[PDB]
């Protein structure tokens, strides 16, 4: 099982946010720490993505684009998994040093979004998602958001996405299961969209609320995220929404 060997081998390890848990919870502190965590996780997502089977088949511009469009969904999905495996979805396990209880969900001003993410986490339990299913699904999320007008080399992307769908099917009553997992994958995208909107709005007013955005987060959220929010870049859904 070469493909799964690779996915297990390249899977990122633990990433800490650097949050000072001694400071009282505040919107500014929680969100600044989430932003720094995003910056740290981005580095791991890039290293992981570049090591994926077939990823180098893509035009280099498209390689950069898919990472910049898909990181939110990738990271939410992995976080939901960590939450499921570590705290049985009782809390949102963003990092070992940044675990959200209900009070933090409220103080972050993202309670509705957190609810949805906790629901996703719970789905890993409700569906008895296996580690191997998780890894294949997560890889597929890298190839699940593209420009409406297409990538630089659309053909190489289409082929790559096709093969990752095939890898998922082979890891998979089979029709029921495939239906379930594709439905779960689709469910990530509306969550990512709500977070895209939230973080964009936050960046714009960040100076007024003392929220710090690191360099790559600020760049990506101002240059790439608006392409999604303006409708130039859209998720690929399995099922019609």
């Amino acid at each position: 099982p070469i493909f799964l060997n690779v996915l297990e081998a390249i899977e990122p390890g633990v990433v800490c946010a650097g949050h000072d848990n001694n400071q009282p919870d505040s919107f500014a502190a929680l969100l600044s720490s989430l932003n720094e965590l995003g910056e740290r996780q981005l580095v791991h997502v890039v290293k992981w993505a570049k090591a994926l089977p077939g990823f180098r088949n893509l035009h280099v511009d498209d390689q950069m684009a898919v990472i910049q469009y898909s990181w939110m969904g990738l990271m939410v999905f992995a976080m939901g998994w960590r939450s499921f495996t570590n705290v049985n979805s009782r809390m949102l396990y963003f990092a070992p040093d940044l675990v959200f209880n209900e009070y933090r969900m409220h103080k972050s001003r993202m309670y509705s979004q957190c609810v949805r993410m906790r629901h996703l986490s719970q789905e890993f339990g409700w569906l008895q998602i296996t580690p191997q299913e998780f890894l294949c699904m997560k890889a597929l999320l890298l190839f699940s958001i593209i420009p409406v007008d297409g990538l630089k080399n659309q053909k190489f992307f289409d082929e790559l996405r096709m093969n990752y769908i095939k890898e998922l099917d082979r890891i998979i009553s089979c029709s029921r299961r495939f239906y379930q997992l594709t439905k779960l994958l689709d469910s990530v995208q509306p969550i990512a969209r709500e977070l895209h909107q939230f973080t964009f709005d936050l960046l714009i007013k960040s100076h007024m609320v003392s929220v710090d955005f690191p360099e790559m987060m600020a760049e990506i959220i101002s240059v790439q995220v608006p392409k999604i929010l303006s409708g130039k870049v859209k998720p690929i859904y399995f099922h019609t929404q």
Binding site: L42, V46, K47, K50, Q63, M64, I67, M216, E219, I220
Partner: peptide, 10 residues
């Protein structure tokens, strides 16, 4: 250029 710099640096 910050993302591209990261991407090209490994």
């Amino acid at each position: 250029g910050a993302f591209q710099n990261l991407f090209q640096s490994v």
